[PDB]
Design a protein around this motif. Structure first.
Motif, short mmCIF file in Angstrom:
data_model
loop_
_atom_site.label_atom_id
_atom_site.label_comp_id
_atom_site.label_asym_id
_atom_site.label_seq_id
_atom_site.Cartn_x
_atom_site.Cartn_y
_atom_site.Cartn_z
N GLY B 9 12.00 7.95 -5.78
CA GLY B 9 12.38 6.99 -4.72
C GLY B 9 11.07 6.18 -5.26
O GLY B 9 10.30 6.46 -6.18
N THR B 10 10.31 5.12 -3.88
CA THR B 10 9.61 4.36 -4.62
C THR B 10 7.87 4.90 -3.28
O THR B 10 7.90 6.20 -3.60
CB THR B 10 9.33 3.15 -4.12
OG1 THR B 10 9.82 2.48 -2.26
CG2 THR B 10 10.73 1.85 -4.85
N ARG B 11 6.81 3.94 -4.40
CA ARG B 11 5.13 4.49 -3.88
C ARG B 11 5.19 5.24 -2.19
O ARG B 11 5.44 6.20 -2.26
CB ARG B 11 4.88 3.40 -3.50
CG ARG B 11 3.74 3.49 -3.11
CD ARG B 11 2.25 4.28 -4.24
NE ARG B 11 1.10 4.40 -3.83
CZ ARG B 11 0.49 4.91 -2.83
NH1 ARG B 11 1.89 6.47 -2.24
NH2 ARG B 11 -0.55 5.20 -3.43
N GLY B 245 3.91 -4.44 -1.06
CA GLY B 245 4.35 -2.57 -1.90
C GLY B 245 5.25 -2.70 -3.01
O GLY B 245 4.85 -3.36 -3.75
N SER B 246 6.18 -1.97 -2.93
CA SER B 246 7.62 -2.02 -3.97
C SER B 246 8.11 -3.24 -4.40
O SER B 246 9.60 -2.89 -4.91
CB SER B 246 7.90 -0.44 -3.97
OG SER B 246 7.40 0.66 -3.72
N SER B 247 8.00 -3.96 -2.73
CA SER B 247 8.89 -5.17 -3.39
C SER B 247 8.65 -6.22 -4.83
O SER B 247 7.35 -5.77 -5.30
CB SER B 247 8.65 -6.27 -2.41
OG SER B 247 9.03 -5.98 -0.80
N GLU B 293 -4.00 -0.93 -6.38
CA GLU B 293 -3.98 0.03 -5.25
C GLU B 293 -5.35 1.06 -4.87
O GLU B 293 -6.72 0.20 -5.51
CB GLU B 293 -3.52 0.94 -6.21
CG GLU B 293 -4.06 2.70 -5.19
CD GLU B 293 -3.02 2.66 -3.99
OE1 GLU B 293 -2.93 3.23 -3.44
OE2 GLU B 293 -2.61 1.72 -4.94
N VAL B 294 -5.41 -0.02 -3.56
CA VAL B 294 -6.86 0.56 -2.46
C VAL B 294 -6.13 1.41 -1.31
O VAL B 294 -4.89 1.48 -0.98
CB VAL B 294 -7.38 -1.14 -1.97
CG1 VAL B 294 -8.01 -0.58 -0.66
CG2 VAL B 294 -8.26 -1.27 -3.59
N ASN B 295 -7.38 2.39 -0.81
CA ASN B 295 -7.51 2.91 0.54
C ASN B 295 -7.19 1.60 1.27
O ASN B 295 -7.40 1.25 2.13
CB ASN B 295 -7.92 3.65 1.21
CG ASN B 295 -7.77 4.85 2.22
OD1 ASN B 295 -7.15 3.92 3.27
ND2 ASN B 295 -8.72 5.43 2.54
N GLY B 310 7.10 -4.72 5.73
CA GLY B 310 8.67 -3.82 6.79
C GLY B 310 8.43 -2.50 6.57
O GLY B 310 9.46 -1.46 7.25
N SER B 311 8.11 -1.91 5.27
CA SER B 311 8.34 -0.25 5.14
C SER B 311 8.32 0.41 5.85
O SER B 311 6.62 0.31 5.48
CB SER B 311 8.15 0.01 3.35
OG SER B 311 9.17 -0.65 2.52
N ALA B 312 8.26 1.58 5.80
CA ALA B 312 8.13 2.98 6.86
C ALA B 312 6.42 3.21 6.78
O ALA B 312 5.48 2.96 7.59
CB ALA B 312 8.90 4.09 6.77
N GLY B 313 5.89 3.68 5.45
CA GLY B 313 4.23 3.58 5.39
C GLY B 313 3.15 2.99 5.68
O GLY B 313 2.59 3.48 6.33
N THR B 314 3.64 1.37 4.54
CA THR B 314 2.35 0.69 4.90
C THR B 314 2.38 0.06 7.15
O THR B 314 1.42 0.38 6.96
CB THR B 314 3.34 -0.98 4.43
OG1 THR B 314 3.36 0.13 2.80
CG2 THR B 314 2.30 -1.32 4.43
N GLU B 315 3.83 0.26 7.79
CA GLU B 315 3.95 0.24 8.25
C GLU B 315 3.07 0.73 10.17
O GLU B 315 2.04 1.17 10.78
CB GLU B 315 5.36 -0.23 9.26
CG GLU B 315 5.07 -1.38 10.93
CD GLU B 315 6.85 -2.08 11.24
OE1 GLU B 315 6.80 -1.53 12.14
OE2 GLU B 315 6.90 -2.61 10.43
C1 TYD Z 1 0.62 -0.86 -2.21
C2 TYD Z 1 -0.25 0.63 -1.57
C3 TYD Z 1 0.53 1.38 -0.72
N1 TYD Z 1 -0.62 2.34 -0.03
C4 TYD Z 1 0.09 3.53 0.76
C5 TYD Z 1 0.10 3.43 2.16
C6 TYD Z 1 1.63 3.87 2.21
O1 TYD Z 1 1.14 5.25 3.54
C7 TYD Z 1 2.01 4.39 1.30
C8 TYD Z 1 3.81 4.13 1.38
O2 TYD Z 1 4.01 2.28 1.95
P1 TYD Z 1 5.39 2.26 2.23
O3 TYD Z 1 5.23 0.50 2.61
O4 TYD Z 1 6.65 3.10 2.57
O5 TYD Z 1 6.34 2.09 0.16
P2 TYD Z 1 6.79 1.54 -0.34
O6 TYD Z 1 6.05 0.07 -0.69
O7 TYD Z 1 7.20 1.25 -1.49
O8 TYD Z 1 8.50 0.69 0.25
O9 TYD Z 1 1.67 3.28 0.11
C9 TYD Z 1 -1.97 2.36 0.33
O10 TYD Z 1 -3.13 2.96 0.47
N2 TYD Z 1 -2.18 1.33 -0.93
C10 TYD Z 1 -1.70 0.13 -1.38
O11 TYD Z 1 -2.68 -0.27 -2.21
#
Ligand code: TYD
Ligand code: BGC
Ligand code: K
Lengths: 7, 401
Positions: B9-11, B245-247, B293-295, B310-315
């Motif tokens: 999968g993605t990030r 994000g991975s968009s 990339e940043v925290n 709106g991907s799960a992680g970022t949200e």
């Molecule tokens: C792009 C990015 C993501 N993230 C991390 C936090 C999220 O928990 C994780 C996954 O996010 P998510 O939005 O679920 O992934 P995708 O964009 O692939 O659908 O990425 C950062 O901490 N810093 C960044 O710069």
């Protein structure tokens, strides 16, 4: 699948 | 003891795996992760041994590109299953369990190797729209029968399509290593009982579903923000953050351009995450700042609002950070998560993936309203359930048995 998308 | 994590999968999926690896480590359990080559930097960062599986990032398609010819789609479908049988056996050496995340098809291959080696297998999904039920339609990741909206039919068709596309390859590779064929191909990849790695308040498991909601799988991101970004934040008022994000595709470039315009129209500074398709700001004025990339766990607590896909992680990260959110959904489970932000009153679910200065401005106004902030701060305390800890215990309990 295996290279992204969405189609 | 060592646990094998397999991510296709993605990030977002990689981070879900990284979070579990972190909780296993704390328990004294080693981990190894099969993941796309693009996971290298992130895995190196957290010290998780990486077994590269899958195509490199530069071979990834982008939203807007034409679909590949049927023969090529079929080749990729077979590759997805076949690379598991080729790589998982070696990666599973010395492991007591296997946890898969990401592509279901890849998961069927992973579970098959685990079954061959007699190792417990677990599969997790990031949201309830990846679990079949009459309550929610499947994630928007593939074209569906034109005109069909009936939830039950969509799932039945999704499953039939899946079985037909991957079943032959799966079962052929299974037979080559002596395993009997799988009849319920769609169900097989989920394991005996799939784990919904999402927060119970942000994304509640729907009824009539045999799954375990552990809560989101996240680690405490201790990474410090880069110096140049720390300075920008100090030299001004709390900016609005843009990130998808991975968009991919031109749509997000356009959206980002409009987002900067709207944000400025409200007298606010801007921070833009470039993403892997390298989004760019409109100009070089000092009221904006572009970052890689940043925290986010750290950054999100220092911004007035966040605009994302709106991907799960970022949200989840934004939700526990208590920051107001403007969601611009594009695919998969994003319309679902956008609706969740709307339902909890912590932001706005933009209507569609293509914002205009008008729609974005209207949404932004609401998102920046004090009520929204107060609400986001409140909700942030209701989504702390530690999923990785819950998941790690399930895994260990399985190894114990
Ligand atoms: C792009 C990015 C993501 N993230 C991390 C936090 C999220 O928990 C994780 C996954 O996010 P998510 O939005 O679920 O992934 P995708 O964009 O692939 O659908 O990425 C950062 O901490 N810093 C960044 O710069
Ligand atoms: C990438 O797409 C897969 C589907 O093939 C999904 O399962 C993952 O969650 C997503 O990141
Ligand atoms: K997603």
């Amino acid at each position: 699948x295996x290279n992204x998308x969405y189609x | 003891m060592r646990v094998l994590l397999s991510v296709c999968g993605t990030r977002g999926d990689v981070e879900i795996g990284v979070a579990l690896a972190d909780r296993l480590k704390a328990l004294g359990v080693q981990t190894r992760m099969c993941a796309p080559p693009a996971a290298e930097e992130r895995l190196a960062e957290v010290g998780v041994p990486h077994v590269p599986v899958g195509l490199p990032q530069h071979m990834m398609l982008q939203e807007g590109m034409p679909p590949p010819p049927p023969e090529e789609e079929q080749r990729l479908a077979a590759m997805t299953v076949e690379m598991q049988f080729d790589a998982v056996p070696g990666a599973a050496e010395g492991c007591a369990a296997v946890v898969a995340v990401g592509d279901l098809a890849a998961a069927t291959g992973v579970r098959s190797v685990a079954e061959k080696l007699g190792l417990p297998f677990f599969y997790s999904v990031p949201s309830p729209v990846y679990l079949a039920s009459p309550h929610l339609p499947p994630a928007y990741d593939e074209p569906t029968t034109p005109g069909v909206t009936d939830i039950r039919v969509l799932w039945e068709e999704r499953a039939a399509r899946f079985a037909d596309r991957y079943g032959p390859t799966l079962n052929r590779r299974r037979a080559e290593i002596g395993l009997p064929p799988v009849e319920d191909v769609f169900g097989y990849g989920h394991g005996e009982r799939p784990l919904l790695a999402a927060d119970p308040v942000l994304a509640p498991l729907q009824p009539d579903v045999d799954a375990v909601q552990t809560g989101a799988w996240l680690l405490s991101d201790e990474r410090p923000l880069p110096p140049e970004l720390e300075a920008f934040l100090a030299a001004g008022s709390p900016p609005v953050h843009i990130g998808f994000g991975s968009s991919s595709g031109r749509g997000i470039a356009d959206a980002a351009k409009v987002a900067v315009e709207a944000i400025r129209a409200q007298g606010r500074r801007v921070i833009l995450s470039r993403g892997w398709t390298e989004l760019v700001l409109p100009d070089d004025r000092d009221d904006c700042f572009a970052i890689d990339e940043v925290n986010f766990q750290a950054l999100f607590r220092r911004v007035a609002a966040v605009i994302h896909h709106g991907s799960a992680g970022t949200e989840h990260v934004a939700t526990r950070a208590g920051v107001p959110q403007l969601v611009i959904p594009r695919n998969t489970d994003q319309p679902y998560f956008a609706g969740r932000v709307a339902a909890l009153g912590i932001g706005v679910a933009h209507d569609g993936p293509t914002p205009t200065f008008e729609s974005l401005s209207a949404a932004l106004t609401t998102v920046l309203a004090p009520e929204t902030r107060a609400r986001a701060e409140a909700v942030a305390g209701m989504v702390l359930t530690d999923g990785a800890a819950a998941a790690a215990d399930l895994v260990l309990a399985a190894v114990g048995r």
